[PDB]
Structure 1
Amino acid sequence: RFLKVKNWETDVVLTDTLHLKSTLETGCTEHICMGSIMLPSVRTKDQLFPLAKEFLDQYYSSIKRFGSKAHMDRLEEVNKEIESTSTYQLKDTELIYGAKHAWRNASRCVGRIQWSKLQVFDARDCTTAHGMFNYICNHVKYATNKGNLRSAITIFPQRTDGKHDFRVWNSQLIRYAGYKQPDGSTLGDPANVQFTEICIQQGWKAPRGRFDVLPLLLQANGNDPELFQIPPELVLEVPIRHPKFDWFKDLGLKWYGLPAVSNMLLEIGGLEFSACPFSGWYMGTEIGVRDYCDNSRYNILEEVAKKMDLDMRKTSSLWKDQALVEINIAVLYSFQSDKVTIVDHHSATESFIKHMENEYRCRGGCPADWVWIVPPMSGSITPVFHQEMLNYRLTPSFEYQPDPWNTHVWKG
Structure 2
Amino acid sequence: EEKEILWNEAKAFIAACYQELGKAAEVKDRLADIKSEIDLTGSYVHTKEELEHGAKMAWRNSNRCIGRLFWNSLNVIDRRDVRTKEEVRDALFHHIETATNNGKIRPTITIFPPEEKGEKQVEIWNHQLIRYAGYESDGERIGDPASCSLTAACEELGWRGERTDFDLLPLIFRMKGDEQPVWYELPRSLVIEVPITHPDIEAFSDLELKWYGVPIISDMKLEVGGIHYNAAPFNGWYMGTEIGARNLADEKRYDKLKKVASVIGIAADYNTDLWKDQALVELNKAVLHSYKKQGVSIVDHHTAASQFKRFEEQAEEAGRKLTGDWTWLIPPISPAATHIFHRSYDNSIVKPNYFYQDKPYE
Same fold (TM over 0.5): yes
Greater fraction of residues in helix: 2
Q: What are the residue-to-residue correspondences of 1:161-310 with 2, within 5 Å?
A: 161-182=117-138, 184-221=139-176, 223=178, 224-310=180-266
- Measured after TM superposition, the shift of residue 128 of structure 1 is 2.2
- Measured after TM superposition, the shift of residue 72 of structure 1 is 1.8
Q: Secondary structure at the match of 2:155?
A: helix
Question: Are positions 1:389 and 2:348 aligned together?
Answer: no
Which position in structure 2 is the counterpart of 1:16?
A: none
Question: Are positions 1:340 and 2:296 aligned together?
Answer: yes
Q: What are the residue-to-residue correspondences of 1:2-401 with 2, within 5 Å?
A: 44-66=2-24, 68=25, 70-182=26-138, 184-221=139-176, 223=178, 224-401=180-357
**CA distance in structure 2 between the aligned counterparts of 1:176 and 1:55, rounded to whole angstroms:** 37
Q: Secondary structure at the match of 1:115?
A: helix
Aligned Cα RMSD in Å? Answer: 1.2
Q: Secondary structure at the match of 1:293?
A: coil
Segment drifting more, 361-370 vs 73-82: 361-370
**CA distance in structure 2 between the aligned counterparts of 1:222 and 1:369, rounded to whole angstroms:** 38
Q: Secondary structure at the match of 2:306?
A: helix
AA aligned to 1:206 is G
Contact 1:129 1:225 in 2 (8 A): no
Structure 1 length-normalised TM:
0.86
**CA distance in structure 1 between the aligned counterparts of 2:158 and 2:262, rounded to whole angstroms:** 40
Contact 1:166 1:222 in 2 (8 A): no
Segment drifting more, 231-240 vs 378-387: 378-387
Q: Deviation string for 1:313-372 (max 9, x for gaps)?
A: 211100000111000010000000111100000100111011112112213321010100
Contact 1:164 1:222 in 2 (8 A): no
**CA distance in structure 2 between the aligned counterparts of 1:363 and 1:260, rounded to whole angstroms:** 31
AA aligned to 2:51 is L
Contact 2:150 2:361 in 1 (8 A): no
AA aligned to 1:98 is G
Contact 1:128 1:221 in 2 (8 A): no
Structure 1 runs (4+) deviating above 3 angstroms are none
Unaligned runs of 5+ in 1: 1-42, 407-412
Contact 2:213 2:296 in 1 (8 A): yes
